[PDB]
Design a protein around this ligand. Structure first.
Ligand SMILES: CCCCCCCCCCCCCCCCCC(=O)OC[C@H](COP(=O)([O-])OCC(O)COP(=O)([O-])OC[C@@H](COC(=O)CCCCCCCCCCCCCCCCC)OC(=O)CCCCCCCCCCCCCCCCC)OC(=O)CCCCCCCCCCCCCCCCC
Ligand SMILES: CCCCCCCCCCCCCCCCCC(=O)OC[C@H](COP(=O)(O)OCCN)OC(=O)CCCCCCCCCCCCCCCCC
Ligand SMILES: NC(=O)C1=CN([C@@H]2O[C@H](COP(=O)(O)OP(=O)(O)OC[C@H]3O[C@@H](n4cnc5c(N)ncnc54)[C@H](OP(=O)(O)O)[C@@H]3O)[C@@H](O)[C@H]2O)C=CC1
Ligand code: SF4
Ligand code: SF4
Ligand code: SF4
Ligand code: SF4
Ligand SMILES: [K+]
Ligand SMILES: [Zn+2]
Lengths: 145, 112, 114, 290, 176, 231, 206, 125, 94, 94
């Protein structure tokens, strides 16, 4: 990108959508990439996410008040390129540069999903998927996460 | 004649034309013991003969110093001695031989 | 397997330099103990010299042996010229170190380290 | 165990030993070695002092940041004793003088103060109490020092039944009043090294068996007082009535009590360390009594 | 372009030689040196009467740290950890969680003032002017532990020094 | 980092106007003092050729007549736009090096005078926000500015891979860094070239044939600070 | 363009020609010659050529690199020869600089350059002290920056930042003692590298 | 004058490392997994060597994280696993090597979003 | 600035200088410690058009070193000989 | 919001307080526990909600460049206020 701005107007602001206790939404950060919509439809097999409205006012969400509770739901945090979808449990606790990454294995089921345990100063901070094509690809279940 | 070269430890030379002729002649003599094709011989003979020609064409020391572009005439004499000493060492080293050994494959690769 | 030597061209040559270093250290200990007013005996000092040589007794590379001798001669020079002080000489003996547990159970009780 | 006192680390300066010790009499000869060994392994040390803070400075480098905490106290003020011990897991009493003063006599220092500390510590719920008495303590001694030690030892045992009582012989070391005493000048003495006594106290805190027991800390060898004093002079290449009476008391043999060996400590000969103590005052070793 | 600092031939005429002889025997240059120290004796000294007088400082002076508030009293710090990331000495330690009202706020904010190099990089990095180096420089202590600041200490410094800190920031923010 | 506060250049002018008188007073104490000259004249003589081979720089070269100053021969920033003379010694001893240093202070005042008069307007850090952070006002209004501020203060700017040896005429002599970049935002290697390092290595050579008190003068004439020597 | 450093083609051309000049004269030792985009000439040589190459550059009339600016080492663990020896030379006659680089490992000596530059004496001691590179025929090789009896060569990439031991004063033995390092606050490792490529011009082949 | 040295390269005795941090450490040689939070792959190019994690504990004074492991922050980079293995062997560290994981090539088709008769047809855009 | 006339004469004579013209103590000649606010200028890249970053990207113009030889006619010097320095006409000799 | 535990130790705005059996509170004997008395969570709750006549409002925290980065806040939801993510000020639409 460029190193400066020439935008001189006010910015759009969007209202937030509650979709459950795992995924916090700050939809003003959404860049309308539709990754979450495609993931929910194709990988999770849940068609509850979409876009409503048109043009600059197009909004990602559920239209109605609905919780997106899927055993694979937490993966939309990973794939959302921006801070629009974030882990509610992880909220505010750490910054990525200070975390130590420990590559390990999930034991919440028998799939053996490959994971990264993020730690800081001797404390486990969060769990992330570790890519393994023959096991979990780049996803983990909510229980693992 | 000048009272000082301006450089501590570098004495004024009374007879610099004769001193330079002796040294440049000695240099070409040592170079004859180097193989004909060696680049050191070809380049050193070339620059030595250029310098020797100026010394044979300029009786005035101040005007010769301007032609040689090497500082005080005493500095030029010192450089002539460094070359002669270098030339003798080159005979023992024989740098014109082929590369002694190739480096490992990624020896000079940066970044890694 | 063709390398540039440091000093010794083979292990027999190197072992000669090792033994000469040991003799130099052996004779220096009485002067070290006196000069630095050490509270260890000369026997303790020579035992330490023997201990330090014997932890390297397994090396078979003459270049590695050479470097241990080069370093061993540097340490001797530091001691003989009194560049070291008392604290440096006494560091070989680890007097303030509480004994570290060796057997499995003792390690198991105190922490997680092997 | 409360989570803050679970041991962590490798036993070093920044480690957590799990010990929270109040050390009374920490500004004296024995205290510095005891505080040092506690601080070496990352213990929390509370140092109640009567002296000037200037006189406590040598203790400051002995612990990592925050591990040595200083307080004021009076031997006669039980509230100042309560503040010092209320948060501790072990209390160590090293209070003593080798002479009497206008304000404190042997009864105050060896009976009343130890009794006050033991009682306040018991009320405060301290788990471990370590009291230093004397090997030659005896109500029948010509020394009033040793008479008071016997009374105090009895009073501490009654007050805090689980106290660990340590009875050392004369202690030799750099700051002792033993080898230094002779060097500044019929009876058998068995002197014990300062560092061995410290190691004995430290192991007494860790050992769960040490609770409720009385120990005798003696060196490995017995000597004639004459042999000893001549040996001190040879190595060095050269007071009150009560003090002389203690030097002239033969060191009791007490086989029924456990010793340094029972706490994992190997006694150190006087011949190895005499040089260390006496080099500053500046050889055939003194014959022993088998 | 160059100049010679010491390339001169003394004049060897009799008047010049006698001038040098007079200087040698009558010590004239040494007497001239005494004139210079004498002239200073009668000069007003440059000493100021500390602590009744103070050395001049500017609004940019980098002194003791402090955490600041908004006019409402809300903390400015939002636990972005940019200060902690930029700190050349790793003197800052931060922990954070959602506050009971959901706000993004720190639960630990320590500055080891004996690791700190008083470089001011933290106050440059802060996006909300939360951490500053204040104007105080008279805070020496009798113990090491007193110089290991936690969040409480730093907030109190902010409440203690805000009147001056706000005025200094006003004087210099147009340069930032 | 920041622009000059308003009023600063006036105060530098006021300072510079009087400084050379302070130099004159220092010269009145030392320059012609026979005792000072007895402590420095013909002390620690180094030949021009020895100076170069032992790695000397700055006044340790110029005291011996060598005509070398990086601000003249390898200029950096705007040193090619100011006028000044390079003091040169003739005896290579402590006294001539002392005279070189005193004269360099005078030439610094001469440069400072030109800097004050020729100070241009404009910005003071490169107008490239992937290297230099944006102004705080921009950081608080523009999205690009905030992102770049955030990244410059956390990751830092990446430097293209490569190695450079860069040197300046520092007050103590040639000061340089051999800086190696592996492409990332942290330097891979940073070797610091401190002029005092080579100068102190020459103390044994320079002290030959002198007395114990002359060692004090010779260490002083090299201008040794151990922060740069030991690093 | 105000924010971009201007190029200097003249210097780049001059240094490239001199690089070829040095390579033609000493083919026995020269392995690589390169000139940076900011015009610094680097000569990469077999380690056997240290004395002849440096001597040539010092004494040759078209070189006259009389001043050794710096001599240092770089540790690159992924190379079989992990140590890169770097000589930075300055020629006052031609107002130019050159860099000569060679390599070695933990057990292979390099020849001392003290005969060519007296300045090299302490630089080689520092390299020995900080990297463990042994210099043959050095007049007085020994540590220079580290403490007496210090074990290890701290500037190696696998030497820990805080080392293995630390010092304190112990009252029981009445001296400073050394013990294994324990840190009240561990140094906090940061992972700062962006996962996005910054400089396509330096991309390595796959 | 070269000499012949057939022995394995072993520098443990001249590196200055204390014994406990050679024999009891386990080096891990691996290519770091992509950070799942980002799509950039530039931090998965090189081989990394790191050591086994050891105890961290809370400092009693401040609660900071304390350590006694001198290798806690030691990370080495290598062009190839072979270079990393070579480095580990000469230093005497026991090590584990994990094969590089590369994403398998995928078959992408934008046209498949609108399939006449297959389940790849998307219900929204 | 408050020395009596006799003292000023004494110290001027002893130093051989007119010290009152160049006092080493500062008075009212220095700048006020409160200044009007600045209004700093912006750099050349502060433009709304004809300002694409790829036209002013210094880092991306950096190239790897040019390799003139890898182990994979007249003589030259590294640069022209340095020209002799001229004596200062300001003050050639101290 | 300073309150004291049963032991009498002040609880900080982060909720910290040594529990009954914690030896670590011995550090406060003869000294004091540094607690800041101005709990930000309480003080920001004192500020009134600001009524605005628009769906979207911006906040910079006041003082222009002396505040925080300017953010725009959506006020569509009628069951809650719009809260600034930086300073905690609240807004509601008429
Ligand atoms: C030599 C002795 C000379 C005695 C003359 C004292 C005097 O009047 O000087 C101050 C007076 C002011 O000098 P200044 O440097 O211009 O002061 C700056 C301001 O103008 C000054 O203005 P100001 O606004 O600052 O004035 C305020 C100041 C008021 O300033 C004063 O009033 C100074 C008072 C000094 C009086 C001392 C008289 C000498 C008594 C002799 C005893 C000591 C010697 C034995 O208020 C004070 O601070 C007074 C506090 C008390 C000071 C303590 C003095 C006690 C000394 C006697 C010790 C007894 C116990 O001097 C003159 O006016 C010049 C003539 C004085 C004779 C000078 C002869 C110089 C020596 C010859 C060269 C030999 C060098 C080798
Ligand atoms: C008619 C016929 C009559 C016959 C008689 C005629 C005789 C009169 C003419 C001769 C006069 C002789 C002068 C006597 C003073 C001694 C002179 C002297 O010795 O000075 C020379 C001495 C060394 O000088 P230097 O330059 O270093 O080297 C020369 C040696 N190769 O340099 C020195 O001594 C330097 C001084 C060192 C001390 C410095 C510290 C104090 C200096 C300031 C003191 C101020 C004066 C003190 C007055 C005291 C009053 C009680
Ligand atoms: N050292 C030996 O040879 C032997 C010692 N012991 C016992 O070991 C313990 C300590 O030995 P040592 O260290 O030599 O004793 P010291 O005399 O060396 O130090 C004793 C400590 O007691 C403190 N103290 C003394 N009187 C009072 C008082 N009235 N109120 C408060 N504090 C007081 C002193 O504090 P201040 O510095 O304020 O005076 C000092 O810290 C004593 O109980 C002693 O009887 C037993 C056998 C032998
Ligand atoms: S993945 Fe994130 S940025 Fe993309 S549409 Fe969903 S919420 Fe918006
Ligand atoms: S970190 Fe990324 S998603 Fe979050 S505000 Fe900045 S640019 Fe937007
Ligand atoms: S002043 Fe510098 S060293 Fe100190 S806390 Fe701020 S950034 Fe860190
Ligand atoms: S003080 Fe500023 S930079 Fe540091 S965490 Fe708080 S808001 Fe971020
Ligand atoms: K996300
Ligand atoms: Zn706001």
């Amino acid at each position: 990108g460029s190193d400066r701005s020439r935008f001189l107007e006010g910015k759009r602001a969007v209202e937030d959508k509650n979709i459950g206790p795992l995924v916090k939404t700050i939809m003003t950060r959404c860049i309308q990439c539709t990754r979450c919509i495609r993931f929910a439809s194709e990988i999770a097999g849940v068609d509850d996410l979409g876009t409503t409205g048109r043009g600059n006012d197009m909004q990602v969400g559920t239209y109605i008040e609905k919780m997106f509770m899927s055993e694979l739901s937490g993966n939309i945090i990973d794939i959302c390129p921006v801070g629009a979808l974030t882990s509610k449990p992880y909220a505010f606790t750490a910054r990525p540069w200070e975390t130590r990454k420990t590559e390990s294995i999930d034991v919440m089921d028998a799939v053996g999903s490959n994971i990264v345990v993020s730690t800081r100063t001797g404390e486990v901070m969060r769990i992330l998927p570790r890519m393994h094509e023959d096991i979990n690809e780049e996803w983990i279940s909510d229980k693992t996460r | 004649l000048k009272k000082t070269t301006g450089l501590v430890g570098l004495a004024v030379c009374e007879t610099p034309h004769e001193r330079l002729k002796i040294l440049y002649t000695k240099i070409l003599d040592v170079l004859g013991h180097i193989p004909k094709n060696a680049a050191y011989r070809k380049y050193t003979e070339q620059i030595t003969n250029e310098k020797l020609s100026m010394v044979k064409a300029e009786p005035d020391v101040k005007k010769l110093e301007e032609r040689l572009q090497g500082g005080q005439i005493e500095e030029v004499i010192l450089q002539a001695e460094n070359e002669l000493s270098l030339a003798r060492k080159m005979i023992q080293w024989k740098p014109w031989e082929p590369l002694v050994e190739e480096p490992p494959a990624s020896q000079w690769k940066w970044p890694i | 397997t063709s390398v540039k030597p440091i000093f010794s061209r083979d292990m027999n040559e190197a072992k000669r330099r090792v033994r000469e270093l040991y003799r130099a250290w052996y004779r220096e200990v009485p002067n070290t103990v006196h000069l630095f007013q050490l509270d260890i005996s000369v026997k303790q000092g020579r035992d330490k010299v023997r201990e330090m040589f014997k932890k390297n007794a397994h090396i078979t590379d003459p270049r590695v042996v050479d470097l241990l001798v080069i370093k061993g001669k540097m340490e001797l020079e530091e001691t003989i010229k009194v560049w070291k002080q008392r604290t440096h000489v006494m560091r070989f003996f680890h007097e303030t170190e509480a004994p570290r547990p060796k057997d499995f159970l003792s390690k198991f009780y105190v922490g997680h380290d092997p | 165990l409360h989570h803050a006192v679970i041991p962590h680390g490798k036993g070093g300066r920044s480690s957590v030993s799990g010990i929270v010790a109040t050390v009374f009499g920490a500004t004296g000869f024995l205290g510095r070695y005891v505080v040092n060994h506690l601080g070496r392994m990352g213990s929390q040390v509370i140092v109640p002092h009567r002296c000037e803070p200037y006189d406590t400075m040598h203790l400051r480098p002995m612990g990592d940041l925050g591990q040595i905490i200083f307080m004021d106290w009076n031997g006669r003020d039980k509230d100042s004793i309560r503040r010092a011990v209320e948060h501790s897991s072990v209390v160590i009493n090293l209070v003593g003088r080798e002479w009497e003063t206008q304000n404190f006599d042997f009864e105050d220092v060896f009976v009343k103060i130890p009794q006050a500390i033991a009682q306040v510590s018991k009320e405060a719920g301290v788990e471990k109490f370590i009291h230093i008495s004397h090997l030659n303590a005896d109500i029948k001694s010509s020394s009033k020092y040793l008479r008071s030690k016997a009374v105090g030892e009895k009073e501490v045992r009654e007050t805090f039944p689980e106290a660990t009582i340590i009875k050392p012989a004369e202690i030799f070391g750099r700051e002792d009043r033993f080898l230094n005493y002779f060097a500044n000048i019929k009876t058998v003495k068995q002197p014990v090294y300062i560092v061995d006594v410290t190691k004995g106290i430290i192991n007494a805190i860790k050992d769960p068996d040490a609770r409720g027991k009385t120990f005798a800390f003696v060196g490995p060898s017995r000597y004639l007082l004459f042999d000893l004093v001549q040996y001190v002079f040879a190595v060095a290449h050269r007071t009150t009535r009560d003090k002389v009476e203690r030097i002239h008391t033969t060191d009791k043999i007490l086989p029924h009590l456990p010793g340094l060996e029972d706490l994992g400590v190997e006694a150190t000969p006087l011949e190895l360390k005499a040089i260390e103590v006496l080099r500053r005052h500046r050889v055939q070793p003194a014959k022993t009594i088998p | 372009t160059y100049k010679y600092v010491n390339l001169r031939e003394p004049s060897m005429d009799m008047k010049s030689v006698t001038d040098r002889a007079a200087q040698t025997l009558l010590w004239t240059e040494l007497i001239r040196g005494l004139g210079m120290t004498l002239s200073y004796l009668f000069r007003e000294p440059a000493t100021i009467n500390y602590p009744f007088e103070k050395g001049p400082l500017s609004p940019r002076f980098r002194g003791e740290h402090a955490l600041r508030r908004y006019p409402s009293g809300e903390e400015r710090c939002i636990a972005c950890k940019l200060c902690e990331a930029v700190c050349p000495a790793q003197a800052i330690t931060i922990e954070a969680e959602p506050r009971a009202d959901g706000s993004r706020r720190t639960t630990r904010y320590d500055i080891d003032m004996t690791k700190c190099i008083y470089c001011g990089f933290c106050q440059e990095a802060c996006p909300v002017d939360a951490i500053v180096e204040g104007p105080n420089f008279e805070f020496s202590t009798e113990t090491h532990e007193e110089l290991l600041y936690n969040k409480e200490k730093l907030l109190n410094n902010g409440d203690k020094w805000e009147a001056e800190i706000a005025a200094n920031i006003q004087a210099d923010y147009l340069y930032r | 980092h920041q622009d000059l506060p308003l009023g600063l250049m006036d105060d530098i002018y006021e300072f510079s106007k009087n400084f050379s008188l302070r130099i004159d007073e220092l010269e009145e104490m030392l320059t012609n003092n026979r005792i000072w000259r007895n402590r420095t004249v013909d002390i620690g003589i180094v030949t021009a050729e020895d100076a170069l081979n032992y790695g000397f720089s700055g006044v340790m070269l110029r005291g011996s007549g060598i005509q070398w100053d990086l601000r003249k021969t390898q200029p950096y920033d705007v040193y090619d736009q100011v006028e000044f003379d390079v003091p040169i010694g003739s005896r290579g001893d402590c006294y001539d090096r002392y005279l070189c240093r005193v004269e360099e202070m005078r030439q610094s005042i001469r440069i400072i005078s030109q800097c004050l008069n020729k100070m241009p307007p404009g910005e003071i850090k490169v107008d490239d926000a992937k290297v230099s952070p944006p102004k705080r006002a921009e950081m608080k209004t523009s999205m690009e500015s905030l992102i770049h501020h955030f990244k410059l203060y956390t990751e830092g700017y990446q430097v293209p891979p490569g190695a450079t040896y860069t040197a300046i005429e520092a007050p103590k002599g040639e000061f340089g860094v051999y800086l190696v970049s592996d492409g990332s935002s942290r330097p891979y290697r940073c070797k610091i070239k401190a002029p005092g390092f080579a100068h102190l290595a020459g103390l044994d050579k320079m002290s030959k044939g002198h007395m114990l008190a002359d060692v004090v003068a010779i260490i002083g004439t090299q201008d040794i600070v151990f922060g740069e020597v030991d690093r | 363009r105000p924010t971009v450093r201007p190029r200097n083609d003249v210097a780049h051309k001059q240094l490239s020609a001199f690089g070829e000049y040095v390579a033609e004269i000493l083919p026995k030792y020269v392995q690589q010659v390169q000139v940076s985009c900011f015009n610094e000439l680097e000569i990469c040589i077999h380690p056997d050529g240290v004395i002849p190459v440096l001597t040539f550059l010092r004494d040759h009339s078209n070189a006259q690199f009389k001043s050794l600016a710096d001599l240092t080492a770089v540790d690159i663990p992924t190379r079989q020869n992990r140590f890169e020896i770097v000589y930075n030379l300055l020629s006052l006659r031609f107002n130019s600089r050159i860099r000569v680089k060679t390599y070695t490992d933990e057990l292979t000596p390099i020849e001392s350059s003290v005969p060519v530059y007296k300045a090299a004496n302490w630089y080689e001691r520092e390299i020995w002290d900080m990297f463990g590179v042994f210099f043959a025929n050095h007049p007085d090789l020994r540590r220079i920056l580290t403490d007496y009896g210090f074990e290890g060569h701290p500037f190696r990439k696998d030497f820990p930042l805080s080392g293995y031991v630390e010092l304190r004063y112990d009252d029981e033995v009445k001296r400073v003692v050394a013990e294994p390092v324990e840190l009240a606050q561990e140094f906090r490792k940061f992972d700062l590298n962006s996962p996005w490529e910054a400089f396509p011009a330096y991309r390595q082949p796959p | 004058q070269l000499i012949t040295v057939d022995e394995k390269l072993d520098i443990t005795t001249i590196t200055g490392v204390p014994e406990e941090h050679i024999k009891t450490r386990k080096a891990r040689i691996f290519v770091p997994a992509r950070n799942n939070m980002q799509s950039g792959v530039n931090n998965t190019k090189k081989w990394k060597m790191e050591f086994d994690t050891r105890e961290r504990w809370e400092n009693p004074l401040m609660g900071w994280a304390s350590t006694a492991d001198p290798l806690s922050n030691l990370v080495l980079t290598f062009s190839t696993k072979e270079d990393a293995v070579a480095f580990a062997e000469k230093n005497g560290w026991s090590y584990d090597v994990e094969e590089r994981k590369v994403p398998k090539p995928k078959s992408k088709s934008y046209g498949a979003n609108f399939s006449w008769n297959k389940r790849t047809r998307v219900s929204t855009k | 600035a408050s020395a009596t006339r006799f003292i000023q004469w004494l110290r001027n004579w002893a130093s051989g200088r007119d010290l009152q013209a160049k006092l080493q103590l500062r008075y009212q000649e220095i700048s006020k410690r409160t200044q009007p606010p600045p209004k700093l200028p912006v750099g050349p890249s502060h433009k709304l058009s004809n300002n694409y970053y790829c036209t002013r990207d210094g880092r991306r113009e950096a190239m790897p070193p040019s390799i003139v030889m890898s182990s994979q006619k007249k003589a030259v010097s590294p640069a022209p000989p340095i020209k002799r320095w001229e004596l200062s006409q300001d003050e050639p000799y101290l | 919001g300073v309150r004291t535990s049963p032991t009498g130790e002040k609880v900080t705005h982060t909720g910290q307080v040594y529990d009954d059996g914690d030896y670590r509170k011995v550090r406060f004997v003869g000294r004091q526990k540094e607690v800041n008395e101005n709990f930000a969570i309480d003080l920001i709750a004192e500020q009134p909600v600001s009524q605005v006549g628009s769906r979207v409002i911006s906040c910079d925290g006041g003082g222009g460049a002396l505040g925080h980065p300017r953010v725009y806040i959506n006020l569509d939801k009628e069951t809650k206020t719009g809260t600034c993510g930086y300073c905690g000020l609240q807004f509601r639409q008429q």
